[PDB]
């Protein structure tokens, strides 16, 4: 399963519900993720017709795979507000061309 293959890209699901993206999330999440290592800005995609705990996909690309691993381990099961976040990896090549709806 593709979400289990370690890469420098982390996918966060269930942060917020469908249509509930805001800029505060992206700013805070990038700051939080700098704890694991250098990281780019959040890249956000919402999947049409998805369940409320899957619709919003937040991607962050770390500079180093070790940081991404640390991020998956620390963020999976942590709370963002009241929501329990699901964290996994994402394929780098799919990410770079903005293919953001792959099964993980």
């Amino acid at each position: 399963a593709m979400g289990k293959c370690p890469t420098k890209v982390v996918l966060l699901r269930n942060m917020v519900g469908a249509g509930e993206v805001d800029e505060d999330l992206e700013v805070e999440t990038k700051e939080e993720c700098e704890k694991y290592g250098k990281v780019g800005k959040c890249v956000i995609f919402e999947i049409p017709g998805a369940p409320d705990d899957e619709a919003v996909r937040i991607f962050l690309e770390f500079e180093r795979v070790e940081s991404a691993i640390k991020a998956v381990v620390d963020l999976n099961g942590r709370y963002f507000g009241g929501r329990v976040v699901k964290a996994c990896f994402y394929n780098l090549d799919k990410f770079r061309v903005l293919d953001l709806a792959e099964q993980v």
Partner: peptide, 9 residues
């Protein structure tokens, strides 16, 4: 800005 990430407990 809102702060929502919570520490693990």
């Amino acid at each position: 800005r809102r702060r929502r990430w919570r520490e693990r407990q």
